[PDB]
């Protein structure tokens, strides 16, 4: 109810931060470098769900 | 640069997995939990000054 939902305050922090490196190292090496990245993420439609 | 971008993508996953999982948690103990997740942290943001 509470003491469950505690715990995961500290781990949106693990992902929060986990994120914030993902992000400088895209916009590191080359922001446009999202455009084509983009596409990947969009090439996953025909995945997850399926054996 | 598609290597940086791929190592990229995998991070992003990963991150992006960890909040899936952790949004998933919350809201399986109870959609409610999200109120006093917002107080507790409302309540960590705020200002001092004396009183």
Same mark, same amino acid.
């Given at each position: 109810?509470? #003491?469950?939902?505690? &715990?995961?305050?500290?781990? %949106?922090?693990?992902?929060?931060? /986990? !994120?914030?490196? #993902?992000?400088q190292? &895209?916009?590191?090496?080359? %922001?446009?470098?999202?455009?084509? /990245? !983009?596409?990947?993420?969009?090439?996953?439609?025909?995945?997850?769900? %399926?054996?």
């Amino acid at each position: 109810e509470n #003491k469950q939902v505690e &715990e995961i305050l500290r781990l %949106e922090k693990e992902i929060e931060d /986990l !994120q914030r490196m #993902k992000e400088q190292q &895209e916009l590191s090496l080359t %922001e446009a470098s999202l455009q084509k /990245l !983009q596409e990947r993420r969009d090439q996953e439609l025909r995945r997850l769900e %399926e054996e």
